[PDB]
A paper describes a structure:
Strikingly, the SidE- and MavC-type enzymes, two recently identified effector families from the bacterial pathogen Legionella pneumophila, can ubiquitinate host substrates through non-canonical mechanisms without engaging any of the conventional ubiquitination machinery. The genomic cluster of MavC encodes three effector proteins: Lpg2147 (MavC itself), Lpg2148 (MavC paralog A, or MvcA), and Lpg2149. Taken together, our data show that MavC can catalyze deamidation, ubiquitination, and deubiquitination by using the same active pocket. In addition to MavC and MvcA, the same genomic cluster in L. pneumophila also encodes a small effector protein, Lpg2149, which has been shown to interact with both enzymes and inhibit their deamidation activities.
The inhibitory role of Lpg2149 in the MavC system is reminiscent of the function of SidJ in the SidE system, although their operation mechanisms are distinct from each other. To understand the detailed molecular mechanisms of Lpg2149-mediated inhibition, we determined the crystal structures of MavC–Lpg2149 and MvcA–Lpg2149 complexes (X-ray statistics in Table 1). The asymmetric unit contains one Lpg2149 and one enzyme for both structures, highlighting a 1:1 molar ratio of the complex formation. Both structures adopt a similar assembly, with the Lpg2149 monomer binding to the connecting region between Catalytic and HBD domains. Lpg2149 forms similar and extensive hydrogen bonding and hydrophobic interactions with MavC and MvcA, which are mainly mediated by the N-terminal α-helix (aa 11–37) and a helix-loop motif (aa 74–86) of Lpg2149. Structural superimposition of MavC in Ub- and Lpg2149-bound states shows that Lpg2149 and Ub occupy a similar binding position and form severe steric clashes with each other, indicating that Lpg2149 can interfere with the interactions between Ub and MavC/MvcA. Upon binding to the enzymes, this C-terminal α-helix folds back and occupies the groove of the very same Lpg2149 molecule. The Catalytic–HBD dual domain of MavC adopts a similar conformation with or without Lpg2149. Given that MavC has the pre-formed Lpg2149 binding surface, we anticipated that MavC may have a stronger binding affinity to Lpg2149 than MvcA. Isothermal titration calorimetry (ITC) experiments confirm that the binding of Lpg2149–MavC (~0.57 nM) is ~50-fold stronger than that of Lpg2149–MvcA (~28.08 nM). Further SEC experiments show that the V20D/L23D/L24D mutant cannot form a stable complex with MavC like WT Lpg2149.
Residue numbers in the entry:
A (entry chain B): 7 to 382
B (entry chain A): 11 to 112
The structure:
C-alpha cells in the first residue's frame, strides 16, 4: 500500500538509478555554474577548444555530492516536504545516553525518520612558546595552546582566546624553562617525556597537566559526520528494522551507499544492535573499538576495515546527537513522485542510465557553451 | 513541492559557486587587506545600486551576477527574482567577511 516500507524502496531505487538528478537541479544551470568556477583551470596556451573540452571531461559536476549534511538535508526534504524539513532541522538535538535507552524510547512503531550528528572532541594537541609581541590571535594557527611570558592561553578553533587561569609567576617559570628549540613548538602530551630528566621536560609535563585539567571544563565538541535513519512502521515488534542513509565527506555518495546495499547490511543488525553499537561509539575508551565500529557504521561499503586505521584511527572521544520526527508516507511518496516526473519530463530515456547520460550531455554542452562565452 | 525543492537546491548551488570563487579570489589579498574591505562594501550595498560594480576589485562572476543575473547565467529559472540573487550575493559576502574579522 502506501506502507512506510514503500517510501524506503522508492528513495533507494531513485537515488541508485539517478544520483545527482534527485536534487532537481536542471542540467543547463548546472553546467553554467561549473563553467564559472572552472575558468581559471582552462589552459590559455594552444587549442582552447580542446582545452575547454579537457576541463569539461575532467569535471566531476554530474557525480553526486558526498557531503554528510547535504545528503541528509536532501533526505529530510523529500521525506517530510520542504517545510516539515525546516521544522525538523530547526528543532533541538539530544545526546545519546550511554546505553542508548533514550533513543530506543524515541522510536514508537510509526513511520519515523531520525537525524543524527556525530561530534568529535577536538581538543588541542600542540603548543607553541611565543613572546607576547609576536602572538596575534587572528594570524595564529587555531586550536592550539600558547605559552606567553606571563600567560597560558587556548586559541580555540573559532579564534577566541581562553585564559587557562595561571599566575604570571607560574608562566614566567615555564616560559624560561623551555629552552630547547625542538620544544619551542611541540606537542602537549609526549608520553615519553621524563620530567626528572631536566627542568625543561619537567616544565613540559607540568604544562601538559595544566592543559589536560582545564580542557575538561572546556567542552568544545565539533560536528564530524551527519546521517539519517528511516525506521518504517513494521507489522510487529520483531519485524521492525531500521535503514541508515548517509554520504561521507570526501569518501562516498548516498548513491554508492545504496549500490553496496549498506543500508540493508546495517539494517540486518536489528534496532537493539544498531543502538548498542552507536552508543558504544560514545562510551568506549579503546581506540581500536572506537575505530572498528566507526568503520562498520560509517565506512563506504566494503571498506569497514580500512576506514579508520593507522593515521585514521579514532583517538578523539565522540558523542551522538539525535532527533526523531514522524513521516507521512503519502506525502513522502508524492514528493518522490514529483522528482520522478521531472526527471522523466526533461531527461527521458528507455532506462535510467540513458536518462543519466542525457543529463550529463546536456550539462557538458551548457558548460562548453558558458566556457566559450568567457574565453571568446 | 517540487518547485520549492528545486529552487532551494539551485540557490545553494549558486551559493556554492559564489563561495568558491570569492574564497579563491580572497586567498590572494594584499597586506593592506584591499579585497576584504571591498567584500565588506558589497555586503552593505543597496539592493538597487548598480554602480559600485563599475570595474571594482571584485571577481568577474560577482559583478556580472549582481548587475544582470539572468544574463550571467542565462539558464537560471525565471522564478528566481533578481533581488533574490542580489540578496544572496550580499548574504554570501557578509558570511565570509565575518569569518575574516575573527
Amino acid at each position: 500500500e502506501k506502507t512506510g516500507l514503500h517510501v524506503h524502496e522508492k528513495i533507494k531505487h531513485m537515488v541508485k538509478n539517478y544520483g545527482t538528478m534527485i536534487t532537481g537541479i536542471p542540467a543547463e544551470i548546472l553546467g553554467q555554474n561549473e563553467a564559472e568556477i572552472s575558468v581559471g583551470y582552462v589552459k590559455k596556451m594552444g587549442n582552447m577548444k580542446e582545452n575547454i573540452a579537457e576541463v569539461v571531461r575532467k569535471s566531476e559536476m554530474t557525480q553526486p555530492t558526498n557531503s554528510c549534511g547535504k545528503a541528509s538535508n536532501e533526505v529530510c526534504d523529500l521525506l517530510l516536504g520542504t517545510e516539515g524539513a525546516s521544522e525538523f532541522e530547526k528543532s533541538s538535538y539530544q545526546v545519546l545516553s550511554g546505553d542508548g535507552s533514550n533513543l530506543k524510547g524515541s522510536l514508537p512503531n510509526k513511520n519515523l525518520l531520525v537525524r543524527v550528528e556525530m561530534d568529535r572532541f577536538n581538543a588541542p594537541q600542540k603548543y607553541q612558546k611565543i613572546k607576547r609581541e609576536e602572538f596575534n590571535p587572528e594570524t595564529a594557527e587555531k586550536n592550539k595552546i600558547y605559552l606567553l611570558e606571563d600567560q597560558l592561553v587556548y586559541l580555540d578553533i573559532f579564534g577566541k582566546v581562553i585564559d587557562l587561569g595561571q599566575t604570571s609567576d607560574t608562566c614566567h617559570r615555564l616560559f624560561n624553562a623551555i629552552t630547547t628549540p625542538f620544544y619551542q613548538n611541540y606537542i602537549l602530551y609526549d608520553e615519553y617525556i621524563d620530567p626528572e630528566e631536566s627542568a625543561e621536560e619537567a616544565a613540559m609535563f607540568e604544562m601538559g597537566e595544566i592543559v589536560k585539567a582545564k580542557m575538561k571544563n572546556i567542552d568544545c565538541w565539533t560536528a564530524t559526520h551527519s546521517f539519517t535513519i528511516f525506521v518504517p512502521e513494521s507489522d510487529s515488534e520483531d519485524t521492525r528494522t531500521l535503514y541508515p542513509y548517509q554520504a561521507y565527506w570526501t569518501s562516498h555518495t548516498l548513491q554508492q551507499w545504496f549500490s553496496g546495499d549498506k543500508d540493508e547490511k546495517l539494517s540486518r543488525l536489528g534496532i537493539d544492535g544498531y543502538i548498542e553499537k552507536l552508543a558504544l561509539l560514545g562510551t568506549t575508551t579503546d581506540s581500536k573499538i572506537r575505530s572498528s565500529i566507526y568503520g562498520e557504521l560509517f565506512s563506504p561499503p566494503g571498506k569497514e576495515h580500512v576506514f579508520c586505521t593507522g593515521m585514521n584511527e579514532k583517538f578523539s572521544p565522540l558523542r551522538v546527537k539525535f532527533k526523531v520526527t514522524e513521516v507521512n508516507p503519502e506525502i513522502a511518496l508524492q514528493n518522490l513522485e514529483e522528482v520522478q516526473e521531472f526527471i522523466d519530463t526533461n531527461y527521458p530515456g528507455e532506462n535510467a542510465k540513458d536518462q543519466c547520460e542525457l543529463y550529463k550531455i546536456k550539462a557538458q554542452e551548457a558548460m562548453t557553451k558558458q566556457l566559450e562565452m568567457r574565453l571568446l | 513541492f517540487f518547485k520549492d525543492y528545486q529552487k532551494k537546491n539551485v540557490m545553494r548551488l549558486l551559493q556554492d559557486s559564489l563561495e568558491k570563487i570569492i574564497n579563491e579570489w580572497l586567498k590572494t589579498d594584499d597586506e593592506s587587506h584591499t579585497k576584504l574591505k571591498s567584500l565588506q562594501e558589497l555586503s552593505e550595498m543597496d539592493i538597487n545600486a548598480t554602480s559600485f560594480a563599475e570595474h571594482s576589485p571584485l571577481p568577474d562572476f560577482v559583478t556580472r551576477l549582481w548587475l544582470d543575473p539572468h544574463k550571467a547565467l542565462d539558464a537560471m529559472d525565471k522564478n528566481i527574482s533578481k533581488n533574490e540573487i542580489r540578496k544572496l550575493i550580499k548574504e554570501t559576502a557578509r558570511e565570509i567577511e565575518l569569518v575574516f574579522t575573527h
